[PDB]
Amino acid sequence: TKGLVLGIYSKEKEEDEPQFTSAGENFNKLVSGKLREILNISGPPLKAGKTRTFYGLHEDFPSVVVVGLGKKTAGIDEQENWHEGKENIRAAVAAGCRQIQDLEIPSVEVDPCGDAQAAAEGAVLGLYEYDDLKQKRKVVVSAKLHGSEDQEAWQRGVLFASGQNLARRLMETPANEMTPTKFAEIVEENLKSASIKTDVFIRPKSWIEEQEMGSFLSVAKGSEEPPVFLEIHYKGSPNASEPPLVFVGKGITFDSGGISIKAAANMDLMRADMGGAATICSAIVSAAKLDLPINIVGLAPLCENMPSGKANKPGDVVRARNGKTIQVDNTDAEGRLILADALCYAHTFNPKVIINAATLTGAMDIALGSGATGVFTNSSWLWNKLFEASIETGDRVWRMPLFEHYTRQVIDCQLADVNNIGKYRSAGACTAAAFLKEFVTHPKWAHLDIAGVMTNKDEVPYLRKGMAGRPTRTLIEFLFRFSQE
């Protein structure tokens, strides 16, 4: 009655035939060699990420999908900066699970493939689709570990993937549903389900005004949708006074550009302009689910960016919480405006680290596309921790420069202390990062521009087309390692 996904490796030069995983070889034994026999008859060997489906092998598993895992011993690939074996497993298991789903089978058991966490990630990421609003849906598939030996690692993969899928849900949902208020309520319920050691404050416009967040308010005011400032606390440290790590996420729930209005083409993707808030909030939910013994604060200014008779006008000058004035030359450079105020507020926590994420610039997509999230940081220690985490998760990061060269192009400003768009078109992600740095005094800060990793087409084999929720798992892995130190 269930489907079964089993792995096979590529044949090594010294082997007579490609080797099954332990689970594949055991299943083959159970069916008196019929799996190997039919795989032989079926023709060419299964290469990494490829699948083949065999029917009627066992009364309990009418459909068995064998998936190619590539080289058994594939480890860290220094030319790709990731663990290749884990990436092979995520892709192959995703492909196998999609095939089971296409056969309309509601239950699947999955070979741990020598790394149950990566297997669970492939299945759970691989099956995910946002289809709440559609009458016609694929069968809902319940994936479970095949066997009972690798359970903690399997559940850890489920938890990591579910954190990323939460971010994908939050990003994909249409903006008329995923308003600042709705986003805050959904993160609140998820965080509270994860741990009772949690406080959530959905701070209203009146509080934003009391906090003198003039830069954030200037963005929100064009729209009739109320802004909120989401503040989430996870109190995981055994010492309540232990300084927290602080995450900050850009939560623009829809970006029209405002008065500096965007072109029509593909503007619908701007419902995911709260991806920064989605990924940092989701990572914190997952950290709470993991019980990590650390204090964490999440901060997400949430609003829409819309044109109207009260919107930001090019040339307007606004005052950030820290008292710096900003000339708003381009109203579509709104993420740095809202982040200025959130980053300022971040310092009030005495944090150990400040990490922000934002779908910030088109220039980042032109720079590195969906190959890797761009990381700008004043701490090589912090860069290296994020980079090492990314190797394990496969959700890659790539360092980008914080140089005074770019700063000079944003503090060169006709009316104010800093200009919100550079003097030139060049290096847009770098001048955006330099603008943020004018609101940071902390010695361990990282800015992640995730505009290029906002969506997947087919680049990441285990994510279906749509909002990607990257790099949620790299953030979770970073927090997990930090908590062990």
């Binding site: 579509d332 610039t361 088109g362 220039a363 078109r425 847009g428």
Partner: peptide
């Protein structure tokens, strides 16, 4: 932000 767009370029430009």
């Amino acid at each position: 932000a767009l370029y430009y």
